[PDB]
């Protein structure tokens, strides 16, 4: 049906769990669905749809970058109507206080990235997380009473920034990690009317990088409840 | 202590709530507070100190725009020490489905303006309002079951805007209303690591403006009690 | 009559001086002109109106910040159809060679503002006086032979500025002071084909902080006589 | 070694061809390469290396997007000691003198991205294809005598473009076509003092859409003889 | 003694005025000034130096746009310790009111030129001319009894400008003229704490184009007082 | 024609080679070309046109910044029909490899003007050489065997660069040298479905400053040898 996706109408969940590692991808499903068909490969996507305690969900890889999330995400929505969409992965601590191993839910994403000033009239769009998905996914956090931190994520272009004085800025404005993708996932949401969230397991600290199964796992619970609660 | 605040530390409650209006800051503090007393008015900008149901809370004006409200809210942070801010106030809706009259919870404030952008390296710096205070703010919706929207505001820095184009395009991103403060507020609270917030009642509707205080004593309501949750 | 201003066409001079303590307005009603009249006090923003050496003037409030005069200043042309506003006021010396007490008339402001930028296309728009003005402000100077330095000014958005290196920067460009209104001002009054103007004392000094009143008496009686040559 | 590659120094060829689709890439390993020996495939990346001509050469994915091309580009000349990266793939017409199935040989690339303002000063870096690359390509398609169409190519962050004009602006200047990438690849080989290009057949037209095997193997002919003499 | 000047220091008076074309100011010298030397002629820019009223004054080309005129100007001030420069030449009207053969005096100049920006932390600086050349001018105008307007300038990047509206716009802010070399100037000056002035005759008009030395011979009377009074 | 050049449709030979000095170019004309006849000298422009091995070429200054160039550029493109235009000059070295009396061909040219961003939506714009005169010039260079460097240059609106940074910045990406046009001249060729191209000879050394006519003589055997070719 689309460039990038050669699955039809219908063969995805309305709610979908995204990573940006396929493997993970293809991981979470053997590992956590049951019933799990490859309905996407394009790209070795590795894009799955099964069941969750009887409920339909799809699973697939989303790439590294806004770029690449922001192409997956805007047919989901567009093309095979999907409703929810949770990011799910690694991020690197920023704040001092969040340590590798932990679990960190965005309430929102900042970026040096330029395609929300593209999409906004060169304005500050706040890419926020939708506040049901938010919601869920904390109350899934309290409910299986696994400690998450919650608060502002940032979505960077460059892996390896050359500016090595925004880590420190963004610590002292607690930013509590950093990713690659929320910041354009967010917006797409809101075009569409329809939701998206994200949380991650702390993998690096970029401020003096210091079982990490353990906490990988426990986020997942967390994703997979909560979509259920969606 | 301040040039703009005559008040010295501990004559501000922890908690304060602020709006614009400084005549209505007044009034707030005659109508819902107990005891209370004029702790600051330097620019006849009526800071109170009194109490809700036996709690020390405070009241002020703001101004409008993001420079003014920058200003009170990082004296109060810095010099004050105060912890918590709930922005309380009017906002014009953008959304279609969002009518006059409608209260409106913000989870995050987009702008036009470029305070935040200076302070984060040119980059887009996401406006995001304390989870704390937002989930203070709808769980007193819920327990006073008081409808409010949820969502995204947008803090301009023209109220009467050149880019007449910049209505539909927000609605079409489903930006609930438009103020002037919130997206200035949020990023100081972060930078103090305390804690800020906004609920406002839409006053008029920007894309076909279509009683008026029975809809402002819900929302005081709601932040009255967010702010003794908080 | 608007959002902000609940005096019809015709209670407002078509002079208007303008600063933003609504409380430092009143006083001026109170202290120079002659029977003055309460025009408008929407969020206490003191507007009066009366006369001076027989002419009709009004005094108001116009809060801090760009956002806040553009406010009042654009209802003033628009609405009740006004022909000059001088803003009268405070502001920071930046250039050593200039102390605290000493007056100031701005030729033109410059901002880090965006309000300019999103009103012009992206490019330089010179926030500049009028001519009519500075030079009715220079020479009412000139006929009460009160010293006062003339040039650029600088309208911040940040009282509190992050970039602390942009105090020398101006210094060496030989920015006179800064105050936070003139750079929305002046570009409004060119929209409306109208006049804007500006006059302030020092009161502070930002590269090294340094009988205040004599100095500000002095500034109103430019200002004033400016006003009715004008 | 690195976080997105389990490879050792040395287990890359000096000289990698890279493109977007990771299937591509083993199709690419199997098809033209001789004894190709997965070297990489952390998230699926199918990262090989083998011979061509009795020349040491590895091909691997790099997803789609500047963010993701930029992550392994910098990895592979830093870490893996790689000295050039020659970037195969397709690519969306603009010209309107340039039909699907046509081959495009970039000699720079522009983009919407804010990846190299950030790393220029915010000025503008032209991402320029290494000039060697460009010439061993070019040449390759003369003696091959295989039509080729030399200039300009643009990578977008936004596949989905919301600014539907930028396609006409973009074909009264003449670029060839889009992708995702070139722009971020070219400045990072300038960075390490090594060479980068990009070859592509156009599979889809933007401005009017329209034996597509057939011009990809002429393009990896030409990029694989390239490579030789390189 | 610099790349673009021959002349050493003393042979510049400290009064330049300055206009475009070579030839014009190569006639100015010959025309207006008594005893007039060849002082530089790099780049055939046409350098001279001789007197009015028996005072030392120069004339030398500086090119067109805002990246000429600041090599010469900068060059001016630093090195041949230059104290004022006037800038005399053409312009194009912008404003209805304004019609070709015209003078105009500029308070100050706007720009779609990132030079100032670059100088001033991305900000926006006020290219404001000298108030003591500008009210110089405009006496030796009233003295003379010429009618000239005074008012706000703009600086172009691009003769053939591309955005086509942006003509309308000025219009409405009533910028009086367009020219290529002001905006450069004026801040140049005030980083030497040194003075500048810009005078123009209209040669045309941008929004509907319809004797012509006549308007200029009086401009150049203007400029010639003003640089006495001066 | 133009109110920049007195020439009309067929003075101007379809080749055209520009250097900034005007009276180089009126060197180069008596100097190279036969039977050279001047055909524009507005402003002392020094536009000439003759043969060069019997083929019709023209040589002109074009002045100093993008701005002027861009003038000149345009209205050859546009009205006298030119199908190429070289750039011919000097430039400053910014790589540490790369030294005075060096000549190099510029690939394309970065730059801190904003005109290329006002032209192409505010994004990245690779001013590009025309790959035809690329390759034309380097030919030239082969068969006369004259050592050449190859790759970016940096065209800057400030020969003053107050960002003293941006040097070392640039060495680090490997810019062979620094001038002020073609950054603008490339994309108006581009516009105009026409070519251009530069070589310069380094005059100086901008990070350590180090027979010289030499250096120049060879460049413009390359250039003319290489309009041959054209
Ligand atoms: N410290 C870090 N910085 C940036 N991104 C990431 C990630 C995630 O994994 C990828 C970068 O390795 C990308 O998809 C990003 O979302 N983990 N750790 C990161
Ligand atoms: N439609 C509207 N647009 C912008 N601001 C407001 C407001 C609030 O009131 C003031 C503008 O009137 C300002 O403080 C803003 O926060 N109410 N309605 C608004
Ligand atoms: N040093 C300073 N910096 C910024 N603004 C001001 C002012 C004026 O008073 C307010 C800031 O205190 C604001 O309205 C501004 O115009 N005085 N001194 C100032
Ligand atoms: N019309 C188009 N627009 C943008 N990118 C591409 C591509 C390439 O394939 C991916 C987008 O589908 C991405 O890697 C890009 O480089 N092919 N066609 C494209
Ligand atoms: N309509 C116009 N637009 C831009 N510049 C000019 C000029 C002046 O002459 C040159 C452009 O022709 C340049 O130096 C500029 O200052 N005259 N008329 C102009
Ligand atoms: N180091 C340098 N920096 C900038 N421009 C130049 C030049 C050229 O000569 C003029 C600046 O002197 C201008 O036309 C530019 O293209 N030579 N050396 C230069």
Partial sequence: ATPHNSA????????????????????????????????????GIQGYTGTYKGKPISVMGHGMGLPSIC?????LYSTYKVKTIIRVGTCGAIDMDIHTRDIVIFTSAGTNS???????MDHDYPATASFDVV?????????????????????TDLF????TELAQLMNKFHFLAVEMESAGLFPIADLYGARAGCICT???????????????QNMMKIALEAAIKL
Wanted: with cysteine; glycine share 4%.
């Fill in 71 to 75: 192409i997956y995400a805007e047919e």
């Fill in 8 to 43: 039809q109408v219908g063969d995805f969940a309305e709610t979908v769990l995204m990573c940006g590692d396929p493997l993970r991808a293809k991981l979470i499903a053997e590992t956590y669905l049951e019933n799990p068909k490859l309905v996407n490969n394009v790209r």
């Fill in 160 to 163: 390896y920034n050359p500016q």
């Fill in 135 to 155: 919601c869920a996914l904390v109350d899934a956090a309290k409910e299986l009473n696994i400690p998450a931190k919650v608060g502002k994520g940032f979505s």
């Fill in 202 to 216: 702390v993998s690096d600290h970029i401020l003096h990088h210091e079982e990490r199964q353990n906490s990988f």
């Fill in 114 to 120: 330029k395609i929300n000033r593209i999409r906004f």
